[PDB]
Design a protein around this ligand. Structure first.
Ligand SMILES: [Zn+2]
Ligand SMILES: [Zn+2]
Lengths: 778, 65, 69, 274, 192, 98, 57, 100
RNA sequence: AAUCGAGAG
DNA sequence: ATACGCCTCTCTGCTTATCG
DNA sequence: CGATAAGCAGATCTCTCGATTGCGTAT
């Protein structure tokens, strides 16, 4: 047997004739699967696509003319269907355009964006529909809206791209750009937080809190913060238009669903009636509300107060009743991951969050670390593209209403039923949504009325520079903590935590300023780009023994709280919850039960002494980080996430599997490293800073960018003339097809102190070898 | 109804008013518009104890280990 | 890209042996060491030059700006 | 240590030194047991460091509190802290209840937006605002229960968080600007005694245990206050030098002396900044 | 870089003595009776209290670090230079470590005998909220390898968990050097 | 108001009580027509679950519901039936390999 | 640089006659000082030279 | 052993709140569509109640009397209703549609 | 000229 | 096609206030 | 007058590259 093979004949045959079915390197495509899948999820998939859901939740914005209790004629402009075309050209009958032409022309590779407006009048009296082109929207290569989507390597070569061209990037002004993946708080999970900044937020502020980052079905997010004041009252927080507002928690608790106060007492305090801490804090809260707001005795009155309080900041229409605008803000701010028609579930989740806040302030649960990988997810970049597009079409829909308002206030008459008037106004506004998206790609700046729940503004897209193929493939696996942490002094954010085992590469990190903040995924790490079928999971859970969350009336860490994506499914004892988690894992790994997708991340937190807040947490959404691992019972592949991993024992190799201690084992230890960190020979014999230096330096080598260089017009390109394959190489050198892109040369190296001209770090090159073309490049 | 220092109506489940906070012999439910008497609510007692993480000291460390 | 004319270290002409190496690998069922020895490459400096050549010229040649594709 | 210390010394000249310290030489005729006794006598003890638990029994039968303060056993705290039943009872009678009532009345203001025992209880009631009972275990030093009656307009208070805050912030026996006095292992022969604070005049009295002529401190501003410019210059040199001693970096004393004489050129502690 | 057969024998014999050092350190920090089993409920409870409480965790880390450093010192003294097949002045690694041309006895020791305990700031490796220091190790494991004590050397290579801990320490060093060079210069500017 | 499709049951059935009141909860895979027992060759875990579950029993009218009081009338014991599975003990002689 | 973070600038193009030569007759095309290793501790480069020689043979 | 199991609606269980007591003058009226609605009233109260649609399709509840001497245990079926009790004087209070 | 991004010691 | 005005996570030291 | 609780200010090596830089409007 031979440990490795050069595969010379196979490689040369494949060079001669590119495959006509599929590329021979499947792993080289799963590397860019996050970016491609994120851009794909906004046009295809269930529910019509992310852009369609985004327009649906943008809804209608109305205005009144004022012409003669009767506010005038109502105009409600909106969009209900958005489509992107694969890029065409008129050079009549159009012809397909491929990115080679965009590269050669030094221009962008963009497809036309079409929105069909709804010019509704008088709530359905008559509707004027007209599709409007809104500029050429840039699209990423190898996506379902790109013309290379299904081509074989043979067809890719015929269309001048590459033998194994990968997408995941855009082309703007003849320059390739990539939306970096950012790592943000885990969605739809309330995590206890201790922050001295919360105390700084004013006076009577503790440092405790409960922060949940709810995500809408169209992948937009809303952060709700549940502060605790030292007196005893709990404060709700949210941000709407780059400003921040505060609300008593009891206001929202009563506004959500028609409920009593004994129900709030039972929801926050379960069977723990004898718990003086909880009872006294809750009495303080209830009496503080009944003192401050004695004229809000029912849900309708509370909603009307909220509506009166929120008029000019929410751009509520003159027709909107106070009750309905209060319902609008309640459905548009509070726990948006449950969406509308989920007031009861939002009520349960707020009660759970309040009890968790009281546990955090009583020191019965430890604070959840927000910078630990256990409590994080990835913002894919295609999702950010969809969110920015939704914000831009919202701005457009508001700008056309601004135009008609300016017409109204300039003294000109109108007719909302007139297609001529609709045409006249639609040509006085800005419809280069595509040009604004191109601006975002070409600068990185995020021009926004809402910060999209994100912290930074600039620094969102980097050029996918192609010095070298390691550099190029590294662009598509780098994840950033955010530019806020770039200028800081808390070194603890850069620490290599054990919570990233198998998700973040321990080695691949740039040295210097971006050390610790710029990370790379382990090469077998996968970021999900779709929601797993979870409709049947609550049904299976009730059969397993989960008592339903509607008629059980339990609360506290004394019981396990079963949740699914932030929705309290039911309550169960801790032992039975452990059994439920084990049985769910078994049924999920064995592919018999149709209601348990293998991507399901059953993150179970056992009871402990002042540890993390317990309960059984189930996740199946987008943006999760998942890695394969061998489930030991029935010996099949399993999928785990960072949240689930910090509690499960996973033997690194099968030799040290212990009795009744391990339920998992890695497929191989080498799948906790990046591609670059796997390509280092005998990495486990060097000092780790030298492995980090190698990851940094292998992206800077004058290797081979690609083979279609006669069809590119890049600003600067470095090409090694004659590369060679390594004699000593990892088994994954072939799996990613790195032989297609040679990076160096096998050299005869004498470790000798002979010359005198190489002492500190210099090295000597043979003159004759140099004259024979050793290490030549252009 | 009565839980420590808290009393809830048995009809609408609304928190009442504390007895010694309003006009005499009549504590009124703000939802049910019912009338409750100051009787049978003799002592709303709550017994609390300190956190046991509240007083870090040299002697407290020696208490356990 | 294309086979080097000479070995880098010693200078032995190894540019006329790449096609023969492929022939001996394909037609004959020879392992790489046997094929390199039968080509006359004894020093490992000369053996590496052929054993590790990639031959990217073939992949470069598929992008021909002078013939219709 | 290190560069933060250099910032404190030469960059900031902070009179508010982060860790003030005094090195107290001991006379050669003072044994280790007396050294520890002096350390515990000097070191401060807060009320929180002697209390095991506190029980607050609110009753609405007008609203009253029964605050019971459970102490560590006498054979424990009178040994570890040099604190007696009498000293504890005096502290609770004088400072604790006054601070507690001050906190309570401030809280309400924010909300509006054996005949010896009998006579002691009567005196405590008369002097204090709204206390109605008081009994201290004068035979075991084990507990202290005192009632506290508020009005009927008063809203509910936790009465445990304020009690904890008062119990922490109330001292028992503290010398100003001094927290702890630890007796480390003697090094290079001489036996030292380092406190976690600077109060030169407090140990000026303790001629018996402390060689006052050799009390060398860490805070440059304090020694400038009490001893003068030149002692400040000496301690500047010493503090700017012993930072380099742990890092084993040899810097000549001419540089440090020139920097010290530039920093004390006006007779004060001038920093190197604007 | 190699040792003798007798040198390797001494190295492995002294390293076998490092099996119970972590368990003894835990039993003595937790004040439990020595020779108590590693799966004792009281030991696990006290280790959990120590995990929650930062100062107690630091005490445990420092005590166990001292014990494993003693084991490392024993290994190095027993195996260098008396356990090395090629000896000074022929042994060039040892030669230039002794001579001051480059390197030190610590580097030679890590290449030939033992990398030893990996120290993060001034403590052992970070622990999760479940008491696990890595997915492989069971919660509250009183094993020196679990705490970052790597018995491997750069000649025979280090295991995956040891590789992970060593990467932690190396990243910490690379961060600390940047912080230090950033902070050095303002002092000199203001003084000058 | 009455939501569409809802039709009020008018004639109810008797309840022979003057005996212990029990509550038992079954899953959706248990045929109710027919502490770890076997039902239809299946494995079911059974355990037990300031009250909220009141008892509504028809009065002597067979047309409405009332709250018994012999202050509600609470069930003497609440049971639960749970679906389970057998977790296979790992055979170490295979996976444990040098 | 090697694949072990052993970066260094080329200090001279040493003529081949002045290069050291082996009993086999070959003259190395790269010379790296032995002092780059004791502090960097890149034993992977040593074992890679070993394995590369064995593989090319 | 199990002798008779009832399917026709006989009894039901509700979740009003902790320690709920109701006067003897009040009654309840059921509705079946399986989704259920319950309704009751008195002078200043309303016993409205619905059920969780997503849960009733999975969990089923059984009631029954037991015989200490015999074996013919009794069995029954009873759905669960999650009820929200409402007042009457605090139901229909509103304000202006928009405050100027 | 700024701003952003990538680097080197 | 085009020419005027519009677009959220550190630190010491100086200085004023303000209330019994 | 004065002693904090509070508010406000100005700080926190050298070198090489590339890419973009502003939108609405009234006539
Ligand atoms: Zn009532
Ligand atoms: Zn040769």
């Amino acid at each position: 047997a031979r440990t490795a093979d050069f595969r010379t004949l196979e490689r040369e045959s494949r060079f001669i004739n590119p495959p006509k079915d599929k590329s021979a390197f499947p792993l080289l495509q799963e590397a860019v699967q996050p970016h491609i899948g994120s851009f794909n999820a906004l046009t295809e998939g269930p529910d019509g696509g992310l852009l369609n859901l985004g327009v649906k939740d943008i809804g209608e914005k109305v205005i009144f003319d004022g012409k003669p209790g009767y506010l005038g004629n109502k105009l409600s402009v909106s969009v209900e269907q958005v489509s992107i075309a694969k890029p065409m050209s008129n050079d009549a009958v159009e012809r397909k355009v491929y990115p080679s032409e965009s590269r050669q022309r030094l221009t962008s590779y963009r497809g036309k964006l079409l929105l069909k407006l709804k010019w509704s009048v008088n709530n359905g009296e008559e509707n004027l529909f007209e599709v409007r082109d809104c500029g050429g929207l840039p699209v990423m290569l190898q996506s379902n809206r790109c013309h290379l989507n299904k081509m074989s390597p043979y067809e890719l070569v015929q269309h001048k791209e590459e033998s194994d061209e990968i997408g995941g990037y855009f082309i703007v002004n003849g320059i390739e750009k990539l939306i970096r993946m950012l790592i943000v708080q885990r969605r739809n999970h309330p995590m206890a937080i201790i922050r001295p900044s919360f105390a700084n937020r004013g006076a009577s502020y503790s440092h405790y809190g409960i922060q949940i980052r709810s995500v809408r079905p169209d992948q937009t997010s809303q952060t709700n913060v549940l502060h605790y004041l030292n007196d005893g009252q709990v404060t709700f927080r949210f941000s709407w238009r780059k400003n921040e507002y505060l609300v008593p928690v009891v206001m929202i608790l009563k506004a959500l669903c028609h409920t009593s106060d004994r129900e709030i007492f039972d929801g926050i305090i379960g069977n723990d009636v004898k718990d003086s801490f909880l009872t006294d804090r809750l009495e303080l809260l209830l009496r503080g509300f009944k003192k401050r707001y004695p004229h809000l005795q029912n849900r309708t009155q509370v909603l009307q107060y909220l509506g009166d309080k929120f008029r000019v900041v929410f751009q509520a229409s003159p027709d909107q009743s106070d009750l309905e605008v209060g319902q609008e803000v309640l459905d548009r701010i509070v726990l948006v991951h449950l969406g509308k028609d989920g007031s009861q579930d939002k009520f349960r989740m707020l009660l759970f969050m309040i009890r968790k806040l009281y546990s955090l302030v009583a020191g019965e649960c430890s604070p959840d670390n927000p910078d630990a990988t256990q409590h994080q997810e990835v913002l894919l970049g295609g999702f950010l593209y969809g969110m920015i597009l939704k914000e831009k079409i919202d701005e457009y829909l508001q700008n056309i209403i601004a135009q008609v308002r300016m017409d109204i206030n300039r003294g000109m008459a109108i007719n909302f039923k007139d297609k001529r008037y609709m045409s006249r106004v639609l040509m006085r506004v800005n419809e280069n949504i595509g040009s604004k998206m191109q601006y975002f790609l070409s600068t990185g700046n995020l021009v926004s009325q809402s910060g999209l729940d994100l912290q930074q503004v600039s620094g969102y897209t980097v050029v996918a520079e192609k010095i070298n193929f390691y550099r190029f493939i590294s662009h598509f696996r780098m994840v950033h903590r955010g530019s806020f942490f770039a200028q800081l002094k808390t070194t603890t954010v850069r620490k290599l935590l054990p919570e990233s085992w198998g998700f973040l590469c321990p080695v691949h990190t740039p040295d210097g300023s971006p050390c610790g903040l710029l990370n790379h995924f382990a090469h077998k790490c996968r970021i999900s780009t779709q929601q797993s079928d979870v409709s049947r999971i609550p049904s299976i859970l009730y059969s397993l023994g989960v008592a339903p969350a509607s008629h059980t009336f339990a609360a506290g860490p004394s019981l396990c709280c079963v949740q699914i994506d932030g929705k309290i499914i039911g309550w169960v004892s801790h032992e039975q919850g452990k059994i439920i988690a084990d049985t769910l894992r078994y049924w999920k790994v064995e592919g018999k039960t149709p209601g348990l997708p293998i991507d399901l991340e059953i993150g179970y937190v056992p009871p402990s002494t002042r540890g993390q807040y317990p309960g059984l947490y189930l996740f199946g959404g987008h943006s999760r980080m998942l890695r394969p691992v061998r489930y030991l019972p029935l010996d099949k592949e399993d999928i785990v996430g960072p949240f689930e991993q910090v509690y499960m024992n996973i033997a690194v190799t099968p030799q040290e599997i212990q009795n009744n201690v391990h339920t998992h084992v890695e497929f191989t230890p080498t799948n906790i490293l990046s591609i670059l960190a796997n390509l280092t020979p005998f990495s486990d014999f060097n000092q780790s800073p030298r492995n980090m230096y190698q990851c940094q330096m292998g992206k800077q080598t004058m290797g081979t960018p690609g083979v279609a260089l006669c069809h590119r017009s890049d600003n600067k390109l470095y090409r090694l003339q004659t590369g060679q394959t390594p004699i000593v190489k990892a088994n994954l050198y072939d799996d990613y097809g790195m032989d297609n892109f040679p990076n160096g040369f096998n050299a005869v190296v004498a470790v000798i102190s002979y010359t005198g001209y190489d002492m500190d770090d210099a090295m000597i090159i043979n003159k004759s070898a140099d004259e024979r073309g050793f290490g030549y490049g252009t | 109804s009565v839980v420590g220092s808290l009393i809830f109506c048995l009809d609408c489940g609304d928190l009442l008013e504390n007895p010694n906070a309003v006009l005499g012999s009549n504590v009124e439910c703000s939802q049910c518009k019912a009338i409750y008497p100051k009787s049978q609510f003799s002592n709303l007692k709550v017994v609390t104890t300190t956190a046991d993480d509240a007083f870090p000291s040299s002697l407290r460390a020696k208490k356990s280990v | 890209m294309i086979v080097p004319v000479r070995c880098f270290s010693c200078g032995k002409v190894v540019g006329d042996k790449w096609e023969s190496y492929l022939n001996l690998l394909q037609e004959d069922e020879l392992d790489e060491g046997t094929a390199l020895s039968r080509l006359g490459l004894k020093r490992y400096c000369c053996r590496r030059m052929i054993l590790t050549h990639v031959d990217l010229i073939e992949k470069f040649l598929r992008y021909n700006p002078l013939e219709k594709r | 240590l290190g560069i933060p210390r250099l910032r404190e010394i030469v960059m900031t000249a902070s009179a508010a030194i982060k860790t003030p310290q005094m090195t107290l030489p001991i006379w050669n005729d003072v044994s280790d047991e007396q050294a520890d006794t002096f350390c515990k006598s000097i070191s401060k003890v807060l009320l929180s460091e002697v209390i095991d638990k506190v029980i607050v029994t609110e009753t609405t039968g007008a609203r009253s509190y029964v605050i019971h303060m459970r102490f560590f056993d006498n054979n424990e705290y009178s040994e570890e802290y040099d604190v007696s039943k009498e000293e504890l009872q005096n502290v609770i009678s004088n400072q604790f209840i006054h601070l507690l009532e001050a906190a309570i009345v401030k809280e309400i203001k924010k909300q509006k937006r054996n005949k010896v025992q009998r006579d002691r209880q009567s005196a405590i009631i008369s002097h204090h605002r709204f206390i109605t009972k008081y009994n201290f275990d004068d035979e075991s030093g084990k507990w202290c229960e005192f009632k506290l009656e508020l009005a009927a307009d008063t809203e509910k208070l936790l009465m445990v968080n304020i009690v904890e805050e008062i119990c922490r912030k109330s001292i028992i026996r503290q010398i100003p600007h001094i927290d702890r006095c630890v007796h480390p292992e003697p090094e290079n022969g001489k036996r030292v005694l380092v406190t976690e604070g600077v109060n030169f005049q407090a140990m000026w009295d303790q001629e018996a245990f402390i060689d006052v002529d050799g009390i060398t401190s860490n805070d440059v501003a304090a020694v400038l206050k009490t001893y003068g410019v030149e002692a400040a210059r000496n301690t500047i040199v010493n503090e700017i030098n012993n930072v380099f001693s742990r890092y084993a970096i040899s810097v000549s004393f001419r540089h440090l002396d020139l920097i010290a004489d530039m920093m004390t050129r006006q007779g004060t502690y001038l920093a190197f900044n604007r | 870089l190699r040792l003798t057969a007798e040198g390797n024998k001494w190295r492995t014999d002294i390293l076998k003595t490092s099996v119970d050092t972590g368990r003894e350190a835990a039993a003595e920090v937790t004040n439990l009776d020595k020779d108590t089993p590693a799966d004792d409920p009281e030991l696990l409870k006290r280790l959990q209290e120590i995990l929650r409480d930062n100062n107690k965790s630091g005490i445990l880390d420092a005590v166990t670090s001292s014990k494993v450093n003693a084991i490392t010192s024993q290994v190095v003294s027993k195996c260098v230079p008396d356990g090395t097949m090629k000896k000074f002045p022929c042994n060039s690694m040892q030669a230039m470590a002794l001579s001051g041309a480059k390197g030190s006895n610590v580097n030679v020791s890590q290449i030939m005998c033992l990398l030893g305990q990996q120290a993060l700031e001034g403590r052992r490796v970070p622990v999760m909220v479940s008491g696990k220091t890595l997915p492989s190790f069971k919660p509250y494991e009183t094993d020196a390898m679990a705490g970052g004590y790597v018995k491997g050397r750069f000649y025979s290579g280090i295991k995956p968990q040891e590789y992970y801990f060593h990467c932690m320490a190396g990243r910490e060093g690379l961060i600390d050097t940047a912080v230090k060079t950033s902070r050095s210069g303002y002092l000199q500017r203001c003084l000058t | 108001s009455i939501p569409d499709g809802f039709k009020k049951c008018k004639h109810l059935k008797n309840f022979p009580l003057n005996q212990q009141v029990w509550l038992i909860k079954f899953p959706s895979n248990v045929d109710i027509s027919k502490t770890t027992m076997t039902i239809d060759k299946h494995d079911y875990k059974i355990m037990d679950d300031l009250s909220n579950m009141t008892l509504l029993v028809p009065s002597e009218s067979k047309e409405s519901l009332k709250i018994a009081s012999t202050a509600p009338l609470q069930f003497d014991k609440v049971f639960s039936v749970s679906e389970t599975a057998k977790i296979p003990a790992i055979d170490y002689s295979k996976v444990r390999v040098p | 640089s090697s694949r072990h973070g052993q970066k260094g600038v080329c200090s001279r193009k040493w003529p081949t006659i002045d290069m050291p030569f082996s009993e086999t007759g070959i003259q190395p095309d790269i010379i790296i000082n032995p002092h780059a290793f004791p502090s960097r501790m890149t034993i992977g480069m040593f074992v890679e030279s070993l394995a590369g020689k064995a593989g090319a043979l | 052993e199990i002798e008779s199991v009832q399917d026709q609606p006989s009894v039901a269980v509700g979740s009003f709140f902790k320690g709920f007591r109701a006067p003897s003058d009040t009654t309840f009226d059921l509705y079946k569509k399986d989704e259920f609605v319950l309704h009751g009233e008195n002078e200043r109260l309303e016993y409205e109640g619905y059920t969780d649609s997503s849960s009733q399709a999975s969990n089923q509840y059984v009631v029954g009397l037991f015989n200490p001497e015999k074996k013919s245990i009794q069995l029954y079926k009873a759905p669960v209703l999650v009820s929200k009790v409402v007042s009457k004087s605090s139901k229909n209070l509103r304000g202006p549609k928009i405050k100027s």
